[PDB]
Design a protein around this ligand. Structure first.
Ligand SMILES: *[C@@H](C)[C@H]1/C(=C/c2[nH]c(/C=C3N=C(/C=C4\NC(=O)C(CC)=C4C)C(C)=C\3CCC(=O)O)c(CCC(=O)O)c2C)NC(=O)[C@@H]1C
Ligand SMILES: *[C@H](C)[C@H]1/C(=C/c2[nH]c(/C=C3N=C(/C=C4\NC(=O)C(CC)=C4C)C(C)=C\3CCC(=O)O)c(CCC(=O)O)c2C)NC(=O)[C@@H]1C
Ligand SMILES: *[C@H](C)[C@H]1/C(=C/c2[nH]c(/C=C3N=C(/C=C4\NC(=O)C(CC)=C4C)C(C)=C\3CCC(=O)O)c(CCC(=O)O)c2C)NC(=O)[C@@H]1C
Lengths: 172, 162
């Protein structure tokens, strides 16, 4: 896997170059947002159970056929698998946010997901609604201006939303 | 690639865990070190042409056979001399990468893994590179944290060769 730093280096090595002063400044800007990124990782992690539960509760309320008998999330083993999948996808979103690169999410998590559900009979597009409901909740917990030093997190917030969006467009 | 952040993520993933304050304190250590690392990366890069050429010359003085002995592995020809400074410029460029990510990952991945096989097949002596790397360390002109952490990576290369 790569982080935001490694990613730049690996695109430079393939060209045989040293990083430019420009590239170095941009990575400095990333280091400048270091604490803010860790507050996002900390916050979503600290509420991870609640984000998962509340997301699944709202999915099953909107989409009652997944839980009716015969539904892909009917029976305890299937329900347990579904909540497990939601927790896994959140965990690897928080990895990508920590490292400031999507490698780990694509490589370890998303890769081959859509074909797994296709083989299983699991409705990918319902999986994607679940991911979206976890997105809104997480952006709201990470953006809470209480009990933190005020500042601007707007790029970070954009970067986070993209990793969820990358998860949702993968399975759907 | 091995960096403090991909190490921390790998440990959590290996245990199927979310990240904890443990892994955050690793990010905190990396982000605070990154000023000296990056300031060192900029410095080496500014000098890179001249350190590489000076380091090649330092080898050719320590080991004058390398310029007078016959055979494609020696710098007794124009191509050999070009190949030699090209090689040293690769070591130096890897060490700047290592500064940028804060760990040995670029060295391991691009340079160190395999190098024994290459040195034996092409009959290149490790001792030529250890000499070039001791020059670089004596001449890069860094001080303080920048120098301590650049030297760390140069000494890692040296120890992989010895
Ligand atoms: C956007 C994400 C929000 C935001 C973030 C923000 N935080 C800081 C400052 C810091 N955050 C921390 C983080 C931690 N300290 C710890 O001990 C732990 C647990 C192990 C964590 C995760 C730290 C150390 C700081 C700096 C010290 C401080 O408390 O200020 C800032 C200020 C900028 C800075 O980096 O110093 C900002 C802007 N602020 C918001 O308004 C968004 C909701
Ligand atoms: C919940 C939102 C939805 C749902 C999910 C569902 N998933 C499974 C089965 C699998 N899910 C995975 C996915 C992964 N496993 C991993 O280890 C990783 C990351 C490293 C991922 C993303 C896999 C591989 C399976 C198959 C293995 C297994 O079932 O344990 C099920 C079970 C299907 C079954 O027939 O048992 C279910 C139910 N179901 C829905 O209805 C929701 C939309
Ligand atoms: C300089 C200190 C001495 C020296 C140099 C010399 N090197 C070669 C040839 C090779 N060097 C490499 C090494 C690398 N290639 C890589 O991709 C990497 C990591 C990114 C490194 C460090 C390789 C693979 C070769 C062989 C293939 C090639 O030619 O590129 C030669 C030529 C040897 C030959 O037999 O053709 C020479 C001359 N020689 C000296 O005498 C100097 C003291």
């Amino acid at each position: 896997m790569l982080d935001a730093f490694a990613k730049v280096v690996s695109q430079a090595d393939a060209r045989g170059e040293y990083l430019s002063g420009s590239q170095i400044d941009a990575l400095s800007a990333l280091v400048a947002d270091g604490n803010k990124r860790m507050d996002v990782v900390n916050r979503i992690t600290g509420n991870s159970s609640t984000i998962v539960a509340n997301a699944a509760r709202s999915l099953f309320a909107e989409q009652p056929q997944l839980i009716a008998p015969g539904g892909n999330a009917y029976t305890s083993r299937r329900m347990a698998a579904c909540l497990r999948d939601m927790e896994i996808i959140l965990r690897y979103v928080t990895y990508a946010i920590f490292a400031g690169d999507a490698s780990v999410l694509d490589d370890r998590c998303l890769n081959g997901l859509k074909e797994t559900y296709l083989a299983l009979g699991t409705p990918g597009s319902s999986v994607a609604v679940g991911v979206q409901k976890m997105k809104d909740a997480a952006l709201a917990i990470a953006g809470d201006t209480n009990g933190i030093t005020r500042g601007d997190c707007a790029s970070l917030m954009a970067e986070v939303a993209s990793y969820f969006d990358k998860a949702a467009s993968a399975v759907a | 690639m091995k960096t403090p952040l991909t190490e921390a993520v790998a440990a959590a993933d290996s245990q199927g865990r979310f990240l904890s304050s443990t892994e955050i304190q690793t990010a905190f250590g990396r982000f605070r070190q990154a000023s000296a690392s990056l300031a060192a990366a900029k410095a080496l890069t500014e000098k890179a042409s001249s350190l590489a050429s000076g380091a090649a010359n330092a080898v050719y003085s320590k080991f004058p056979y390398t310029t007078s002995q016959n055979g494609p592995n020696f710098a007794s020809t124009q191509t050999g001399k070009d190949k030699c400074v090209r090689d040293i410029g690769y070591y130096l460029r890897m060490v700047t990468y290592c500064l940028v990510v804060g760990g040995t990952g670029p060295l391991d991945d691009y340079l160190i893994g395999g190098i024994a096989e290459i040195n034996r097949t092409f009959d290149l002596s490790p001792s030529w590179y250890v000499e070039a790397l001791k020059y670089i360390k004596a001449n890069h002109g860094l001080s303080g944290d920048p120098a301590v952490e650049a030297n760390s990576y140069i000494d890692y290369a040296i120890n992989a060769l010895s």
